[PDB]
């Protein structure tokens, strides 16, 4: 699967550089809202079946590495660059930019990474129609398919 | 420690070898199996399955669980009698067996 | 090659350093055990770095020789204390070996 | 973390080896607190690969 | 109510479904959205393995 993971990551990078149109942005917004509600901002352990709890966490863990951790690294990098600037300007050590700028960088970079990999997070929740999480996943997929006038798995 | 270990080896493996040296008319197998039990059932190569999670990962543990049950299926095996049971779940996380003893076959753990 | 099913288990190259194949469960356990064997040396390796650095920097006659007035050693249980590390090595070897056996 | 637990620290050094390497031993903790992180994290990835 | 002989094999019963309507069994099974992809993968693996 490392080959698949690399291919998926590269596909997302090309798509982000390519850009998105009205239909793609609308579909992405639906996926991003679904993932945030059911995965990021929900305790995965509270689902009924073990299978959906396990796979939901796998999606949640994958989201954390691909969005939260990446955003923190990019946000920290921007904060560190500002920190170096202020240190040179004041000729001393300054601690204010680290929290404030890091938070601002994280808020700026989280939406872009979430947009970049929104499709992957949505697809990993396809546990099956037999479960509540899968049924809601299928419902959003049908709506996205209708909006995009295409079919996806 | 080596001296105690050697003494245990002598008690189990050296002296009993001389108890039987000729065919026996009465209960030959019982008498031969008596001396073989003390040597073949030492905890050196029996103990460990109780702490198998130290080296067996959850999925590896599940595969090894069915491998062990098949391997030690022979009823006439004193070592299997002294070995820790394979009918148990991984203490960290179990992925195949939900309940111990809720099987579809008395021998296969699944 | 049993049909399209590639049954070859070893693909080691000319300058292979690891095991020939990692499909066997025995080799996987050995490979995992060896990797973590090296892991549990952080404190020891750092300690030897400092004593090497100290001796090479100050213990030469030029810098800071020390008048060793001690006549005889007086250690009584340092051997037992030191042997914890090799003891753990033996326990790890026995545990991993037995589980495979 | 060693000699501190002993209320006769001179005895602690004398009884082990009669040699004093405490300075290097206690300085090594700082370096040993971070020298292992890359090994630990890669091992976590390696363990997951075995689990898969 | 049951016909008092439920489960009895009718005399001369033949295990044929030549003119059976399969549309009544649709709700008895569930297929995932990637059924088409799974079908091709199943065919691919079987051909290259067996």
């Amino acid at each position: 699967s490392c080959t698949t993971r690399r291919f998926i990551d590269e596909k997302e990078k090309l798509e982000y550089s390519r850009g998105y149109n009205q239909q793609e942005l609308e579909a992405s917004k639906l996926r991003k809202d679904f993932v945030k509600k059911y995965i990021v901002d929900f305790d995965t352990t509270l689902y009924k079946t073990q299978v959906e709890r396990d796979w939901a966490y796998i999606a949640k863990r994958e989201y954390r590495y691909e969005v939260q951790l990446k955003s923190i690294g990019y946000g920290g990098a921007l904060a560190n660059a500002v920190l170096l600037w202020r240190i040179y300007a004041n000729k001393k050590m300054v601690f204010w930019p680290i929290p404030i700028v890091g938070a601002l960088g994280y808020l700026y970079f989280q939406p872009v990474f979430f947009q970049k990999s929104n499709k992957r997070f949505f697809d990993m929740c396809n546990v099956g129609e037999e479960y509540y999480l899968g049924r809601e996943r299928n419902k959003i997929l049908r709506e996205c398919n209708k909006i995009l006038n295409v079919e996806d798995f | 420690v080596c001296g105690i270990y050697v003494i245990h080896v002598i008690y189990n493996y050296m002296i009993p070898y001389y108890w039987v040296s000729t065919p026996l008319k009465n209960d030959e197998f019982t008498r031969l199996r008596m001396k073989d039990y003390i040597a073949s059932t030492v905890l050196e190569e029996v103990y460990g399955i109780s702490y198998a999670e130290w080296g067996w990962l959850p999925h590896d543990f599940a595969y090894n669980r069915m491998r062990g049950l098949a391997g030690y299926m022979h009823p006439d095996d004193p070592r299997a009698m002294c070995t820790s049971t394979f009918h148990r779940k991984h203490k960290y996380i179990e992925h195949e067996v939900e309940k111990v003893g809720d099987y579809h076959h008395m021998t296969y753990p699944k | 090659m049993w049909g399209n099913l590639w049954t070859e288990a070893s693909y080691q190259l000319n300058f292979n350093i690891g095991f020939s194949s990692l499909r066997s469960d025995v080799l996987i356990h050995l490979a995992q055990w060896q990797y973590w064997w090296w892991f549990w040396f952080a404190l020891i390796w750092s300690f030897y770095y400092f004593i090497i650095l100290k001796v090479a920097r100050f213990r030469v006659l030029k810098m800071r020789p020390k008048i060793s007035t001690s006549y005889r050693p007086h250690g009584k249980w340092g051997d037992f204390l030191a042997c914890i590390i090799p003891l753990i090595w033996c326990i790890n070897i026995l545990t991993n070996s037995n589980l495979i056996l | 973390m060693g000699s501190v637990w002993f209320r006769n620290r001179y005895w602690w050094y004398r009884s082990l080896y009669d040699d004093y390497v405490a300075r290097e031993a206690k300085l090594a903790f700082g370096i040993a607190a971070f020298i292992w992180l890359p090994h630990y994290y890669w091992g976590i990835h390696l363990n997951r690969a075995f689990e898969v | 109510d049951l016909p008092a002989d439920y489960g009895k094999m009718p005399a001369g019963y033949n295990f044929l479904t030549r003119g059976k309507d399969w549309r009544e069994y649709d709700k008895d099974f569930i297929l995932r959205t990637d059924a088409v992809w799974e079908k091709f993968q199943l065919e691919h693996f079987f051909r290259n393995y067996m």
Binding site: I58, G128 | - | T95 | - | -
Partner: peptide, 20 residues
């Protein structure tokens, strides 16, 4: 040993069968 492996990936679940 006790924690020689130093970590266990309990998150990795049993692969779910996806056959039709």
């Amino acid at each position: 040993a006790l924690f020689f492996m130093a970590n266990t990936a309990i998150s990795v679940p049993s692969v779910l069968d996806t056959s039709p």
